[PDB]
Design a protein around this ligand. Structure first.
Ligand SMILES: O=C(O)Cc1cccc([N+](=O)[O-])c1
Ligand code: NI
Ligand code: NI
Length: 257
């Protein structure tokens, strides 16, 4: 019964999941000076025109916006990837304060939040099988800084009062995730893991260099969510980020000079 506290947070997870101390754990600090520009990188293709959002769920640690992943409707390809990766869900990690919240860091800088668009490799047939493979997932990570509002985020923010507590869901159709992307698709990439239990080492991370801007008010609404279930003491859903882990024997590659 894991979480983000003193008693059950990141620093305890290894007792249940020894892979927490593995060779390709996420997130990491991105040392921009040491990331090497890679000309082998094929261009990134984000094809979200046919996306079909279905539902938004408070899963007790975050909220997930879920997609129909039963066809190639929203796919990621190119970049460092071989083959086609289908969007299953997106979620965020965020802080109690604007000065922290991201999982990845950039030259030790923490952003207020980080958006994760999770895709699985269609060669494995479904998500569950894909997470058992070293190349099973591709996660597109986007930093959030506080400034101007992100118009394309407001629909997500406004429904959060309907899923305040763990296990609540709401219909969430017709949401266009294109409205959450920055202008540039320049990126860093490296091999890593999921950042909650079970910490599986199945992710090709693709972290965009350009953050999106959200308003103070938008992020405040994230912080009104609850980790707890209804009828349990209230514990605000904040600081649901794992800190940076050792890079070990990995290289971070840059798609840009
Ligand atoms: O890495 C995370 O944010 C945690 C996590 C946990 C379970 C599934 C996830 N997913 O990527 O579908 C992500
Ligand atoms: Ni548990
Ligand atoms: Ni995540």
């Amino acid at each position: 019964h894991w979480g983000y506290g003193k008693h059950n947070g990141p620093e305890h997870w290894h007792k249940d999941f020894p892979i927490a101390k593995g060779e390709r754990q996420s997130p990491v600090d991105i040392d921009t000076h040491t990331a090497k520009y890679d000309p082998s990188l094929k261009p990134l293709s984000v094809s979200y025109d046919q996306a079909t959002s279905l539902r938004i769920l408070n899963n007790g640690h975050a909220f997930n916006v879920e997609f129909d992943d039963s066809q190639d409707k929203a796919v990621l390809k190119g970049g460092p990837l071989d083959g086609t990766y289908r969007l299953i869900q997106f979620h965020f990690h965020w802080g109690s304060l604007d000065g922290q919240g991201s999982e990845h860091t950039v030259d030790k800088k923490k952003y207020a939040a980080e958006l994760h668009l999770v895709h699985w490799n269609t060669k494995y047939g479904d998500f569950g099988k894909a997470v058992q493979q070293p190349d099973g997932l591709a996660v597109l990570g986007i930093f959030l800084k506080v400034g101007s509002a992100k118009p394309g985020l407001q629909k997500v923010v406004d429904v959060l009062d309907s899923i305040k507590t763990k296990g609540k869901s709401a219909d969430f159709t017709n949401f266009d995730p294109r409205g959450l992307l920055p202008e540039s698709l320049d990126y860093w990439t490296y091999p890593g893991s999921l950042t909650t239990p079970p910490l599986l080492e199945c992710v090709t991370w693709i972290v965009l260099k350009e953050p999106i801007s959200v308003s103070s008010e938008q992020v405040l609404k994230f912080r009104k969510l609850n980790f707890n279930g209804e009828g349990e003491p209230e514990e605000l859903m904040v600081d649901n980020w794992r800190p940076a882990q050792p890079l070990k024997n990995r290289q971070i590659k840059a798609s840009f000079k």
